[PDB]
Design an enzyme around this catalytic site. Sequence first.
Site, mmCIF file in Angstrom:
data_model
loop_
_atom_site.group_PDB
_atom_site.id
_atom_site.type_symbol
_atom_site.label_atom_id
_atom_site.label_comp_id
_atom_site.label_asym_id
_atom_site.label_seq_id
_atom_site.Cartn_x
_atom_site.Cartn_y
_atom_site.Cartn_z
ATOM 1 N N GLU A 285 -46.775 39.303 60.318
ATOM 2 C CA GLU A 285 -46.804 40.009 61.484
ATOM 3 C C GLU A 285 -45.944 41.396 60.927
ATOM 4 C CB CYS A 319 -43.349 44.294 66.098
ATOM 5 S SG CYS A 319 -42.615 44.421 64.763
#
EC number: 1.2.1.88
Lengths: 534, 545
Positions: A285, A319
Amino acid sequence: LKVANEPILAFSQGSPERDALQKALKDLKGQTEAIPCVVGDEEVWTSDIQYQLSPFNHAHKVAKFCYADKALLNRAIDAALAARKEWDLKPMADRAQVFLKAADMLSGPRRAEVLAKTMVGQGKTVIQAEIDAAAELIDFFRFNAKFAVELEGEQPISVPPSTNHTVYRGLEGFVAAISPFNFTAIGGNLAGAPALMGNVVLWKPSDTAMLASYAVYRILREAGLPPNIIQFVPADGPTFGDTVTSSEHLCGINFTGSVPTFKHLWRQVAQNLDRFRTFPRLAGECGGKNFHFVHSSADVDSVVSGTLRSAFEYGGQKCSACSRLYVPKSLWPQIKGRLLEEHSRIKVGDPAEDFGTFFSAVIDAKAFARIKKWLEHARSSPSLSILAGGQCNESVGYYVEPCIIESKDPQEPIMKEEIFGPVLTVYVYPDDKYRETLKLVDSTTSYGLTGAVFAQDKAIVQEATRMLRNAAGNFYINDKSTGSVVGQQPFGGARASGTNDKPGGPHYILRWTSPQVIKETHKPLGDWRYSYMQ
Amino acid sequence: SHMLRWKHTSSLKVANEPILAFSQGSPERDALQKALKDLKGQTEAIPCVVGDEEVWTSDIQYQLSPFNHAHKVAKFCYADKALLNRAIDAALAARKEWDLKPMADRAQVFLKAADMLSGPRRAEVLAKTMVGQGKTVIQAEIDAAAELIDFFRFNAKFAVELEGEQPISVPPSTNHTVYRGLEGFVAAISPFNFTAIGGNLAGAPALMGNVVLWKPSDTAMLASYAVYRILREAGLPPNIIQFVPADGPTFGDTVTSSEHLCGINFTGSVPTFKHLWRQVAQNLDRFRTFPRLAGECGGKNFHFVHSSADVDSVVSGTLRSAFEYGGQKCSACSRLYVPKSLWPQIKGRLLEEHSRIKVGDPAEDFGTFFSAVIDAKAFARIKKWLEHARSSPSLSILAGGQCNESVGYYVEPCIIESKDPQEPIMKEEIFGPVLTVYVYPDDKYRETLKLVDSTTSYGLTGAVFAQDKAIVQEATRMLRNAAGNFYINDKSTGSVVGQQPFGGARASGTNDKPGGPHYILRWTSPQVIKETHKPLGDWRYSYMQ
């Protein structure tokens, strides 16, 4: 197995949870925990001593820990490998029980502790710690347990005289889990999810989240995780990467962090393919450059509050955080005026001492410096203007004020590159160019993580949804781009944002099992010939 | 009021395709005979297909009939790099519309193709697999018909039902998962030995909204093109699957050089898979996203016999596993472990039955058990192993051992005994009709089980023959990672879609279990959409007051 999401507490004055958190915060004031590497049940110290600092008061060393060297990491691999067979042979339910017990501990008696350690060690405010170290982590543990238990019910067809059964084996070897500073819950999931599926794990927690990370580790051990299933091994990044990718026994890397680092690991695995006993599975990720796109029909109040939260909560260190806002010219006077007024009311300060704080200092000296470089760029670029904020001061903590910038260039570097700080860039587009601008949302950056469209026109929402199909793996209509909830918005995206294994959803655990199918035949076999041959 | 409306999802009832008997006078046997006659003396000129355009390059190639290599069953050509890149461009330009089609509509194509293969096209695909790949009736039937049909039907079921897997919604929001195809193109690279594998490698990603460049196996071109034509006839739109035979290295170089590569679906050799993996890693900075590599790579598979085994089942199951289709299966038994106590009975029976195995022309003689191996390269490799067997002091040929390539690539079934459990022939995949036997002392069965597990680099298939429950349980635990498809009292080959999802780890591949419900998940990159139906509140939280 039946599970529901953990409630998010309100922390009202005089509430049990607020009193408990205050005590837990007082419990950490002035304290430094000496956190060792843990291999099996052994607490190991090396000479490579490191410190975790409280982001809003860097004079406070919240933890002293150490980096595992190549030799210690190799020892941790050997010990883990020796424990793997028995762990993998345990019924799925039995492994699940460890995580369900850990979840109950985090929900109740340990909630205040992990919230406080996340606040003091990582600089989170009360609610940011609550949604992370409590709710998200708890949900990862309960939902993954449900998913795993239910996976064993996914069985093939049996036709007499044979019986077929799928055994969801853990991967053979060890998994390296590499977690980021910004969510306590992510560390728990990166190490925990593979362990749940019968794997053994070397967990390199983030330096800047060591205090809360070790708290989670201890809870797992106390909940019944046996020795050598998860090794707690802080280490220098490159040293850890070099060591795990050099081992013939590596079977997976569960990573959350930078694109370049993930790419480096991917290339190291590829360089060493001939050494490995099986093909390692890489999960990554890797962040985003996330958008809020506003149509002229949007509810302005929702645009303003949702964008302030997405862009600035936890200093924009997500994020999923909104860093590019697209506004039609017709709404800009409203949105600009409202953003600037609300901006002046944002309190940045010590989140332990002042619950009025909206967000606090950024994580460390390196983040502070990177973010300052972006503010300096905003003061230099001919296409950029700082509308509000832009101040920073690292004398006491790594404090960066929320900053709102307007760009006249929709393709400016600040519109493309992930800053991981409280820095929002706004591009104002002509109302009649909304379609062209939607295309720019899709084409501008290398990322594909989160995005939001604000609009109250159905046709516009349908059109935008189709056009942005691959611009965001987590796509939001009239809501902010952050705050995915386990079991509700499985999280992840493609393009440069990673492998998109959707942690928080039912399929994530499939990356950490290598199924075996067993067919048992209950009648003797016939002749080798076939009747048509006669 | 909800601006996004999500339709209810349907369900699909499918079952395994029944295997036909091909008895004398039966319709399927007459139809197969006719389809075989239809191919006798025929050479099909098979073009590359890009969109609907049939393209020829100068790199002309021939597919030969393995049992009569004077018969060129197909003339085809290798796509050049220009054509491959044009195919990529055209596929990409077709992708968004295809991805946006409802899953149910894409599935319909495969369900239609499945029905065509089941009925009117069955004899054709069987015959082309027999003539072009050297399969016998029953080997073609379980492959080009049953398995391929099952892939199409079961994957369609799994895909349609996958849309029913949806997240929790709580007020004030609605959450929906969109099972997006991968953004870019997928390269499908298929092996000679199963017609069905090519159909699945290209077809499964297509089903999930992907576009594909399919490089079929040179030595299975005839049957592969037949499958491709059936897919197009069943309604597959242009540029969704590009039919692009090519030089292997050239193909790999081209697809791994494209910024738009999003996956490689591969079945073949370990070294080639590793090479592709490394090429992707080399080009990591050029790609729009991280490509997904899926690889199934072969095995060195075992039948392990315990003293309590049923002897007749051991013999028949081992003969089939080792020798059907000339042992040219990633799942074929190539090492047999037998306890000293049963070796006299088992050896006697194997040698007796061995003498009864007929090798010959599968089209002209349905009495044939298995036929020639696939090509000159395979023949040469097997010949060298037979020679190694003669030279090696640790090896003795018990039966067979001869070969003849004057008419076809004919190799006798060969049974070899090794006195060394670590002999190279016990470790290396031969992909020929060569069984090696190791005899172990009954009282060392546990130590021997450890050897079964440790001897090779592979983890694909294996079988234990035993009637002792305690032993079966023990062996099952000990051999957990020695075989991804593990068999108790049955042969190590012949996995059936939906019943034994197929694949293994160690050096045998990524183990994505084609034939099971999860395989399709490698070919979708899900998006989750949250629609919120109420205005948001303030940015502050009450606790901050």
